[model samples]
Target chain A: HPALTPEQKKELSDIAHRIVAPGKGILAADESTGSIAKRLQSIGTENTEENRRFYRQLLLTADDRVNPCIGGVILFHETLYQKADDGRPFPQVIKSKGGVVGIKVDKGVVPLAGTNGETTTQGLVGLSERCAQYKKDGADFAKWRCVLKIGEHTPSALAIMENANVLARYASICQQNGIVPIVEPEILPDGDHDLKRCQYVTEKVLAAVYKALSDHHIYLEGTLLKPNMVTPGHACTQKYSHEEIAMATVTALRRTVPPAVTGVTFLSGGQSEEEASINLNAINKCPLLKPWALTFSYGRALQASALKAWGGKKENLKAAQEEYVKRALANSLACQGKYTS
Target chain B: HPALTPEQKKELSDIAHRIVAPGKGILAADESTGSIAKRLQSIGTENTEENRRFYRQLLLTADDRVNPCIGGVILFHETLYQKADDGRPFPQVIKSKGGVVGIKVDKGVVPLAGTNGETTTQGLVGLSERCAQYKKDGADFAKWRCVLKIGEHTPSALAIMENANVLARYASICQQNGIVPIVEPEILPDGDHDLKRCQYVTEKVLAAVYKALSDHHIYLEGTLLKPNMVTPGHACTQKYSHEEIAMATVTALRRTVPPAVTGVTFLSGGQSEEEASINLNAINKCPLLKPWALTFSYGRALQASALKAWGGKKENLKAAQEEYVKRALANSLACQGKYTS
Candidate 1:
């Protein structure tokens, strides 16, 4: 039941590995309309098309120092087709800086019937055709996120299996069209659960996801995993150090993620900028036989300060881009366990 | 995220319970065209629409003695629409004789890539509409089979997750249309593996299945499980007794199958008639607090002798029906742990 030829496998594997090379990670700029609206609203900026494009440009066209740190940039559908000041497409601009281009292809999550507020991602409808068109239009990879929650009787088996299977199907369809898939089964950190519970749930969820991927015959070497760094619930009373979080995250990944997968790019998951970088640095320093590149795929932590600094004004564009570049450099050092404050 | 209302749950649960009532099992006459072709070819009879109808009529019109034994009769699509000699539809005939009607709903298995020839069942395209139509046309239940094999690195995690998710999707669709689904994840007894391996694999496969069912929000009380009895591989050098097979099957079921499921109807999977009954009897007497009704849903085990006895002749109909009744009676007693010979 070989689904892909050797050539196809090599293409996917190469693209995935290139996106998470040593000391580099992803720039998750793929916020959908609703999500981007929140970000723009936070910075007192209008949610116009040009505003979105301009904001994206501020991040994508950061200084050359970010060139080696940012290995990939994930774009929304509209941003993927938007152009920069030089009339160059955003994808081309990212490529010119040597970063791979990826697109978020999932529509969004829909409620699973009979679940306690659980949902599975939609957008598998004609996904192969969508991937084919995206590939021809400058996308080398794709991201689809399935969110799982942790609570009593939450992250229920149904939530875990449904999300895992959906991710696998998305991955299978993407790879068939020569696109590496960033498989994101993001476990939301919104409850009062402890770190150990988060670790247990993350392990179970990844096991189910990898099993589904294998069942779907996904090319693992051509796929990347975008997972939340294991942490206690946002409202948990107990506090833990960065080292504890890093150990939990790395141990969970090692148990479930097959070594064949190209990388494990950590989602910021609402963590503060300093905390996110510190955690990434600790994870890289964890004493484990880590097999894949473990790096950052930050959206909020990388952009919050920059967005506020720009404040939707032309005079602040340079300041915004500089802030973005600073964060990229910090994460670059952290991914290699060398960050100094 | 509640998919089914209270009234809907009650209806489905009642239907499933009625199909596996005490001292009653199922008659699995739902062999597809290719399958029935092989069955007919075995007795030197040509496969034809009329012949298929006649054979099904013979089973449905069996003597009243079978009524206490056969709680349900599963029909293929063609036979579901066919009529008896007395001008009654086959479903009507079976219902008049106290049997619920079911239709096989899966198309067939398709190969999974990157694995050692594992496959997943595909029939979910417009399944809801099909189930609705079947329900209106006299069907109260449906069956879909997903096959798995035992070997070195066989039944890979992919096969287990893929099949389990497919079956869950099928069940979810069927229940939406008021049809109870008989979930059958038949791990084939084809390897040289030992009984313990089969038991272990069965436990793992079933664990994944129930997890998927939970993930899909399927109502376990509204569905029936048709699983293979745990036994050594067909080519195994060692043999196990009926008691051993019963213990293994019951233990596996207890470990994974939630008590909420209405019934566990074991597929014969090429078992000889006497062997099937004796094992089922042993299973009922396994000294475990089995929650679901454990019974037989045998095709070949119930039909082989009868088909050969009929020899496709009109005069042999009575003899064939008699053989069928005898097997049904044997299974009826076995299901109650009352079989002596």
Candidate 2:
């Protein structure tokens, strides 16, 4: 058992609290090259390194509205090393914005046989060393994703256990290396299942994740949870309102996620910009005894409007920055249940 | 998700059942090279391929007394390809004796940091391919041991979940290759914890294991469990007798292991040969609706006496075989609650 000194515990716990500060959440700009290619291509921008850096810089150097709106900014390996317009590192800019710098550490998911199209995330080969290096390179926190798919009998117990175990392992390592780990056991919204199934899978996944974190002796106060909102699968005919999704999501979190964890940061997978903010607002206002912070660590949701506005045009910088700021403030207010459109 | 056809499921189930047939269990002779070093040195023998083969042959070629007593023999990678005295592969000799052949597929355990000395087993790198090859080479079953230590804060959530998830992944791969997987999550006898602590840890660990197995879609009917019989840690002052250990072990099993599993093959761990046999016998006699076969998968307990008798001498082989047969028959009858000593 890795015994944590009180100093180490306090440091990580404080960092986690700061990242999920009231009316604040993370801006997940750490989309991998492959994922970003789709994001950039959708806006007809070339997937070149410079364009990637420019887009990231555009978000990182946004107007002051983002300072209070975002408590943290997640950087992919590339962006963490890339420089902003004034030649300062992106991490430095993010820090200047009163935001913590976070890194996405998991490589990606690989298939597990005998599972129903499930996967286990793999970046554990040398994660302790990697987390230490990332911490030295300006990351105050880290993220590792383990995905679970929804299918009729999918998300078999194996996928849940495999993903949960890895997330625990990742969190434990990150904490040891002076980094807060945001555990993302994201259940993909790709199935045709109803809201109950999503909530069922989310509950099972989070229960297993917390159990694993306990088994691993992870300091919960030093961690964050990045989970999917319990919405019906994409193709489900049952149309649930934001209020329903919010209730289901909150209930699931209450049942499994410990209050000791610093916050619950929702992933806006495939949700449109407005939908993402509205659902998050609904979630924060859900009539539940939620003990932890409810916020958003969204990639597409936080960037879609800005990406569309920028269209990768240099003259559209202010326009892109405005879109980014607007979305950020909206999400910030949504997280506080104070948003009005 | 790896979907198994009915025929595939049935074949795996049958193999697992055959390995834990009534009044019988497995012989875990799959010690790694390093472990075998200690065993060979204790008997004043050099650790060599020839010596290893000879030692394995001694166990596999024992007389008919063991034929009914042993349902399976688990082979280390080294011995899986070795020849018996009559030039038959050890697997063939075991098969001829009506015993299923199992291969140890896990590479070994790796360090998991941020815990009080924990580890996750590491054979899943390319397990499916290994399992396929093992199936082609006459192995009807596979064994992978993931060790968990019990301390004041040991068997941490990370260790339990990580180890259990790996075991599930291993089981899934083996089933896909027509190999029955004997799931072994052996809690070490390394702590000074009490029987209650051991039971509590065992229950939690097994609960995670089965859930992972289900998530992985591992057919429980195609799996055998190799759990340590619950007892106080090695340094505990609490003097527990066979009945108490049996009650603790059986209760833990009843609480966690699913009924669909083919059997429970108790690991001897650090128990003496006599103690192992008596405790297993007591376990069988415990008044519970035991759904799966409860038996032995003893390593040193079955071979310690035999090794001493042989002392690496061909002339003493008969003496060694006698020792082996005596313990096999004792355990065979004990597994049925009919042993007289």
Candidate 3:
């Protein structure tokens, strides 16, 4: 379907490049109400519209220090329409602070029948219409996540093929509407597999995703990839340094992801805020010809400390914003390999 | 998910074996009305239901000579229900002659977007329900055809991935209703690509297909593959021998098709009647440990000479049936590596 026209390609590529501009990364605040439940509960706060708005404002309305660090802010549908105390829409606030606006568009993962606990992401029912609406709603980019797990038998061929197609379809639809797609095929750190095994699966999964994107006629130059860094399973026996993981991740990407992709904004998975930054820094420092921008699209790693500092109270909003800006700067430097301990 | 139950496996395996019993092959009379148009027009016959019925009857009602050679007969939906002049149903007539009944379940190929004119088979819309009804109506197996093309930038990753997944999904649905699936990924002989190029594309395509089938948890033992034999593109400057084609075809199959598959029933693609038989004979005689039965499930290759002999005339029915029987007997011996010419 040489699917996209030249104008569409120009718009998409421009959006993608701006989202990962020099010394910049992404802040993944697009957690749904259901997903944000645990974060709010952990801070003993009620999960309500006003509370969600307040929390998002705390991050999006941070000081000018974060303006140069965060290239984009991913907002949930709720937060996208919410307003600050000054009554400005949250999207307006982010753009004023020089950040591109993105939204998480995937509904969620569903069981892939006949697989051993594997899944493909859904929400493609009316994705084209949804993407067009999202574009008009101030979102220049969108995120769709498909997950793969590590096990003795998995991720199976169906899991990889099915998920890759779903992500590719999502990307194609988004690009047609002038929204840069953040293609996230996350392989969870939930098993005991070692670094080499994880690297192998990561390579295979990325290869399939790119092939699907090619098939669906996606404009790779207009898309951003949000992949999990190749790390050993959380329960692995052998431990490796950040440099070792960086080498593995970069090597895998070099083998599969084409040079045409605009940028790779990595998911932190379950890594702590400090660890995520350290690893991202190491990845940028890796002595390989990585063709795309390597940056963070972190959720918990960017929010945990800020959420804790706020502690569900009004008095600590400033402290929370400070914490958010701190990580934003850390990640900004990490994405450039300039972060130090 | 290890998809099938033990009883399901046994039933599928047994059905597959019965269809490719030694020295036997399939009679592909399953051309839909849309496809049968050319065949009928060539003989100056109207594409009428009765004409179609009469033609199928001529093939199905052949004398006892075809009983042993024709292990199965694939019928279009209309032929599956049409009755003989004696008021006997078509499926019953074939069964009475010791042949199993199969149905063509694929709607047809549709363009795969973003490819260089490649396509994937559809008919998966309500495949499970259709297969269940077909099973109840005497279809013990089903066929779906997916097309791939060879070119410098053709058979793109998207074509291979999309077609493979569709075939796997079709096979999975068919097996759920006790209908064996003949998975056909037909690489068109339309390019100027040479034998080696054809073989290379064949191997890559088959590898992807088998991997997808495995991912979908399709029981390999219950499925038959109807692949095109490795042959140079019709316009290729280089020529190759039947032995060369056989070697290319077998080597590709051995590398990708699992040993668990019950049989390989090759499509005639565009080969002529004699050429198809010669190639099948050479494939059978190739010095390789072919793990599955290598046989024919041909349409044009088995019908062209017979159709010309009849010229759509009622008085020439006997001559047409005799011609059909001759080709069937030849293919029967070819499948056993015993055909003299």
Alpha-carbon lDDT, every model: 0.90, 0.87, 0.89
Q: Could you say which candidate leads in lDDT?
A: 1
TM-score for chain A of every candidate model?
A: 0.99, 0.98, 0.99
Clashing pairs in 3: A1-B113, A1-B114, A115-B1, A116-B1
User: What tens-digit string does per-residue lDDT give for candidate 3 at A280-299?
Assistant: 99999987666578999999
Residue B116 lDDT (model 3) = 73
- Score every model by TM-score: 0.54, 0.54, 0.54
Candidate 2's residue-wise lDDT over B133-226, tens digit each? Answer: 9899999998998999887778787888788888888888888889999898988888789998898788778878876875676777788899
> Candidate 1 lDDT, tens digit per residue, B2-45?
47988999999899999999999999999998999999998888
Shift of residue A73 alpha carbon in model 1, Å? 0.3
CA lDDT, candidate 3, residue B286: 88
- Candidate 3 displacement at residue A271 in angstroms: 0.6
Candidate 1: where is the Cα deviation over 4 Å? B1-341
TM-score of chain A of 2: 0.98
